[PDB]
């Protein structure tokens, strides 16, 4: 359930974020909020596009600790966002720590839900 919980937790954060919903141009009104759709990373062979299963990939850092990277999409009737997540096992919590998380919507500035501790000097 590692990747499943990671994805459920992440997509839930994205969906509830007012700014992200605005970037996705959600049809949110007095009758209710648009029901967004989510799926794994979109891949193509240049013939047709499809979503890959939701999964994370692992990569070791300089301290010998494993980081998990996961990409998925959130789609509204008008836009598709690409969400990137980096997480790492927490030595204190059950759930892993979210290290970096951003959302890319075409034509919009990359939006960080979780800004890394290690940030550009021009923060």
What does this structure look like?
- 17% of the residues lie in helices and 37% in strands.
- It has 123 residues and is an alpha+beta fold.
- The strands form 2 sheets. Strands 1, 4, 5, 6, 7 and 8 form a 6-stranded antiparallel sheet that branches. The chain has a two-stranded antiparallel ribbon with strand order 2-3.
- Strand 7 (97-104) and strand 8 form a beta hairpin.
- It comes from Saccharomyces cerevisiae (strain ATCC 204508 / S288c) (Baker's yeast).
- Its main location: mitochondrion.
- Residues 1-123 are mitochondrial intermembrane.
Total of helices: 2
Radius of gyration: 16 Å
Number of strands: 8
Sheet with the most strands, sense and barrel status: 6 strands, antiparallel
Helix content: 10-25%
The succession of helices and strands, N to C, reads: HHEEEEEEEE
Membrane topology: Single-pass membrane protein
GO biological process, one term: protein insertion into mitochondrial inner membrane
GO cellular component, one term: mitochondrial inner membrane
Main location: mitochondrion
Could you give the topology of this structure?
Elements: H1 2-16, H2 18-23, E1 37-40, E2 42-44, E3 49-51, E4 56-60, E5 66-75, E6 80-88, E7 97-104, E8 111-114
Antiparallel strand pairs: 1-5, 2-3, 4-5, 5-6, 6-7, 7-8
GO cellular component, one term: mitochondrion
GO biological process, one term: protein insertion into mitochondrial inner membrane
Organism: Saccharomyces cerevisiae (strain ATCC 204508 / S288c) (Baker's yeast)
Summed up:
The protein has helices at 2-16, 18-23; strands at 37-40, 42-44, 49-51, 56-60, 66-75, 80-88, 97-104, 111-114. The longest helix has 15 residues, at 2-16. The chain is globular and about 50 Å long.
């Amino acid at each position: 359930s590692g990747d499943t919980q990671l994805f459920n937790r992440a997509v839930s954060m994205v969906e509830k974020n007012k700014d992200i919903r605005s970037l996705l141009q959600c049809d949110d009104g007095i009758t209710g909020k648009e029901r967004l759709k989510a799926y794994g990373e979109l891949i193509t062979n240049d013939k047709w596009t499809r979503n890959r299963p939701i999964v994370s990939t692992k990569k070791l850092d300089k301290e010998g600790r494993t980081h998990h990277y996961m990409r998925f999409h959130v789609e509204s009737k008008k836009k598709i966002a690409l969400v990137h997540l980096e997480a790492k096992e927490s030595k204190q919590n059950y759930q892993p720590d979210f290290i970096n998380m951003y959302v890319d919507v075409p034509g919009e500035k990359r939006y960080y839900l979780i800004k890394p501790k290690l940030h550009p000097v021009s923060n």
